[PDB]
A paper describes a structure:
A medium sized shell (~23 nm, T = 4) is present in both constructs in low abundance. The two T = 4 shell structures from both mini-shell constructs appear largely identical, except that the β4-α2 loop of CsoS1A from mini-shell 1 is disordered. Three different sized shells with T = 3, T = 4 and T = 9 icosahedral symmetries are built of essentially the same hexameric CsoS1A and pentameric CsoS4A, which are highly conserved across α-cyanobacteria and many proteobacteria. All the shell proteins possess the same concave-out orientation, consistent with other shell assemblies. Intriguingly, only T = 9 shells generated from mini-shell 2 contain extra densities not accounted for by CsoS1A and CsoS4A at the inner surface of the shell, which are absent in T = 4 and T = 3 shells. The angles between capsomeres in interfaces 1 and 2 vary slightly among three shells, from 30° to 35° and 30° to 43°, respectively, leading to small curvature changes in the shell assembly, thus the size differences. Despite a large deviation of the tilt angle (from 0° to 43°), the main interactions at the interface between adjacent hexamers, which is mediated by the hydrogen bond network involving Lys29, Ala30, and Arg83, remain largely conserved.
Carboxysomes are anabolic BMCs for autotrophic CO2 fixation found in all cyanobacteria and many proteobacteria. The carboxysome is composed of a polyhedral shell that encapsulates the key CO2-fixation enzyme, ribulose-1,5-bisphosphate carboxylase/oxygenase (Rubisco), and carbonic anhydrase (CA), which dehydrates HCO3− to CO2, the substrate for Rubisco carboxylation. In α-carboxysomes, the disordered linker protein CsoS2 plays an essential role in carboxysome assembly and Rubisco encapsulation. In this work, we synthetically engineer α-carboxysome shells using minimal shell components derived from a chemoautotroph Halothiobacillus (H.) neapolitanus, a model system in the fundamental studies and synthetic engineering, and determine high-resolution cryoEM structures of the shells of variable constituents.
Numbering used by the authors:
A (entry chain D), B (entry chain C), C (entry chain E), D (entry chain E), E (entry chain D), F (entry chain C), ...: 6 to 97
K (entry chain A), L (entry chain A), M (entry chain A): 1 to 81
Write the structure that this text describes.
Amino acid sequence: GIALGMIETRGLVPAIEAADAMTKAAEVRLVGRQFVGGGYVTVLVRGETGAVNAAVRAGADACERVGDGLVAAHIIARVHSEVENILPKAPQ
Amino acid sequence: GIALGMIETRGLVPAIEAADAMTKAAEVRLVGRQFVGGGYVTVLVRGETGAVNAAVRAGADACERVGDGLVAAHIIARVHSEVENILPKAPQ
Amino acid sequence: GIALGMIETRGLVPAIEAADAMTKAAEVRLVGRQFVGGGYVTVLVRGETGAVNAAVRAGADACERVGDGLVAAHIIARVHSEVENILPKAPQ
Amino acid sequence: GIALGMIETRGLVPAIEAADAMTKAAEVRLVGRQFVGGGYVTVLVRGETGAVNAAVRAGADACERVGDGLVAAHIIARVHSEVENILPKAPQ
Amino acid sequence: GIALGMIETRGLVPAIEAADAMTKAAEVRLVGRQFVGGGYVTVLVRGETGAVNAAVRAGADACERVGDGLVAAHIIARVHSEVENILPKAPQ
Amino acid sequence: GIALGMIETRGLVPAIEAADAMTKAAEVRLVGRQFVGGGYVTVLVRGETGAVNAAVRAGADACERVGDGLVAAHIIARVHSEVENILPKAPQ
Amino acid sequence: GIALGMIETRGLVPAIEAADAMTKAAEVRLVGRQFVGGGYVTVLVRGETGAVNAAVRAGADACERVGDGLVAAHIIARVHSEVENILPKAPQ
Amino acid sequence: GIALGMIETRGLVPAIEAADAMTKAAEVRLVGRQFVGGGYVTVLVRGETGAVNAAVRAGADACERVGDGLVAAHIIARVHSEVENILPKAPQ
Amino acid sequence: GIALGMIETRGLVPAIEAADAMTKAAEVRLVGRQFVGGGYVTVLVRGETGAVNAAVRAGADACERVGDGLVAAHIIARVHSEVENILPKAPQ
Amino acid sequence: GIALGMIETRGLVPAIEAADAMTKAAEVRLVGRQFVGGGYVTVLVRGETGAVNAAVRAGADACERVGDGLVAAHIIARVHSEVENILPKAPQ
Amino acid sequence: MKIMQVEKTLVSTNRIADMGHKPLLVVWEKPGAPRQVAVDAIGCIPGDWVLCVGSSAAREAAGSKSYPSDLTIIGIIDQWN
Amino acid sequence: MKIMQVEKTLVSTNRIADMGHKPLLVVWEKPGAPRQVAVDAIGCIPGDWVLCVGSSAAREAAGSKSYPSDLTIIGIIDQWN
Amino acid sequence: MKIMQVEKTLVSTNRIADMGHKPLLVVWEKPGAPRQVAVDAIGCIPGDWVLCVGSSAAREAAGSKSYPSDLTIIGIIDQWN
């Protein structure tokens, strides 16, 4: 599936918890983890729309209480072609 | 299209949402996504003036609510050659 | 020993103190230290569940009063396979 | 044309707007754009003293109401030879 | 001379003004300009103790009013050998 | 579809109404109806995540008003193998 | 393009500033400057609708503060044939 | 069509807007645009009575808001031969 | 010397005084004097940027207390090529 | 470079400081230092208009807080031929 | 109102939040006719013959003055073929 | 509601101010069918299969009681072809 | 909304007073298609490609909740053929 789930946090530890919850909740693949600068860390998963919905909801609830918390939990069902050039394909 | 559109966000999730909205709103080329440092992320598209105008308005209205929100949605219809030099040609 | 322990600190000195306390309190391998940006530094240890629990409690207790202090202390008893892709194997 | 004009902005969008206004207002070569860290972005133009004066005034006026805004606008009519070592010759 | 003069500022533009004033005031060589993260920029000069004193005083006064201002203006007459490994020798 | 949807009701009439709504709302397989004892009745459907999500929302909104009403409407997109063991395969 | 941009001012100097801003902002050709009597001066540009929009906005903001200011800044995307007989084709 | 429609405006931009509206509203011939002096501009169209009526109403409602606005929107269905003499035949 | 300086006056006497002061203060060629209608008279000089700055300041200072006075004093350091079509080359 | 910059000080120390700052700020030749009588000392520099402007501003800023202070800072962009007879060509 | 046959169900996961939890059915007038999507305010099965109201009555038929529906099933025909 | 395919985007620079900043998509029912323009309340891509509501529900679907829309995309179909 | 081409102007002298002073344009979808009349809220010329909204959005698009319009032009397409 080509649906994108994004979770942003202050700091890496809530991002790790959110990614763990996201992958445990639904059939989604962790596609990246980006340090944004300033403490922002974003975790990106790909999958089917329903799966990504469930994963992002679970990740948001899981990481809301960890560290400095959650910034954003957004869902894009279909990403434009141009946006796939700024989306990492594998996590380093 | 040599017109330029820029959107600045606090964090990367609103930047991806804004770039998605912009690229789905009109025929614009996503030519960059820069981490300014400190939390700011800027997304740059190129296209003809009407395309860029419509895309930037859609992206601003789409990413105003996401995360810590929007910082700037600016359109430059005529960009000087010198500026072009500092503008990314392709996104990485 | 596949349990994961995490500690965030505002600064590298509390991070180093927490990592030293973690490694001294229980047999946990310190698998990473990440500069998150913004001043956040995270330390990641892998080990047996009870070992990681003891180590993370000792690390949080040791680094609460060091420098700017502690941000997050989290234990995941078993992480998903997708999450191991964003977890360092060894520091540098 | 060895006068130096500088503009700081909180973010890249006001920096790009200020650079475009600077280049359009007077014949000044935009010799650099530096991400300073923390969100500060600086734009550096070289030109004749009166040209740099006009350009820096236009740039500050253009970028005051863009994004998070303007931080510094400075003109040095003649810089020391030691300072040219820390001034970029051309952007990238 | 091996005396070290340091000036720290929020942002690059006051640092540039401070370096210009420092080199115009006394016989000191600009030995580096370091982005520290968070907006901090430091400029380092080397010379004789009296020269470095005059230069750092002039730079502090010059950059106090520029942008977000001055953070620190410090003078070290003789630097330890170990500290020369963390001091840049030429400005990039 | 390995996603699971569950609806719990006080009494059997709201359970039948909820199962009717769920099976008419999406492509989901009614795989069980358990009398928990004490008055609770649970209805379990299996399907792909989007189907289960839509079906459970429709069933909850349909059976909220019926009888003594709803107790729980829960969706599990990713169900562990161990859990599958306790889940009825066919309704009796 | 056949879109018309018009700017009216009290006096010639704000009209000159508006025409300069209009042509610097977008790809529009100055097609005329008409003295209307009574102090009214109008500047007319032609181009594509998006270009003319950006140009007229920039010209309005630029000349709002000059002299006795701005009277009207209007945009016509498609002009009727009959109106091209009262529109100058080149500026004398 | 020997009916006459006239619209008077303060300034030329509302006159052009009114003439555009009139010529797009009905089958009317734009036969003149006179600078009366002092700021007034008059636009004269000819056509059959219904065409002129519809055109003048549309033009008045279109140019009421533009610039310093409307001064007069008058329809003459039957024009004396003597008057015809003073009426421009073609616009210049 | 392609910088443009403009002065509006209410009347021809302050315009002539401003033109004389402009020409005496710096080496600027007086390229035009336009009767704008309504009493506005504009004087246009071309020269080097610093020359035009000095000349326009002197002209405004000289003509503020002459006749009905001064309306506008504006400097454009570099005008667009489209604007030169509406700028006189020499007076008459 | 025929522009003239002048600075008066009450005393020779602020005059020397102002001359040094003037010469360091822009490329201006210090053509004279006159003891006026009564304690007034004047310093005269010749150069390009923008250079003289920058130099005189720097000199006034530097000598305001030196000794008894500053009396006058004046720039003449172009002096009459009669005035050159009372302007020194070089100091002694 | 129109007489329709229920083809199947339709799921749109990312549909607007104002659509609520209401189910959506793909219906046609007759097999092979152009498909439409109706809000299922009744709870019918595929093969049912149903009554569908369009225009602004479908909004209130789906539960609110503001509901985003232009086609709502409001009944099952007792006897149709 | 109708099931549509997104053809492309449409830009009208001089459109009325009451249209806001909302994007406009050219959609058809099927390739070759008459084109229509829908307000994109979802953010879909060309080739998507979408749900479109007409009548007065499209106005509120686009964000306001007063919005000038008679066709608004309100969801992307999870599975369609 | 629909994509139309402006054919010409239409004048109805004795039209109801509630129509105001707004111009009326004869438009078709394509040359030869059935004609319709739209309220010109934009000011377009014959041969233009325009966006037309129907239903109740055309009323407010023409300037009022109570305006007697069921088709209003709300924009000119920048690029169409």
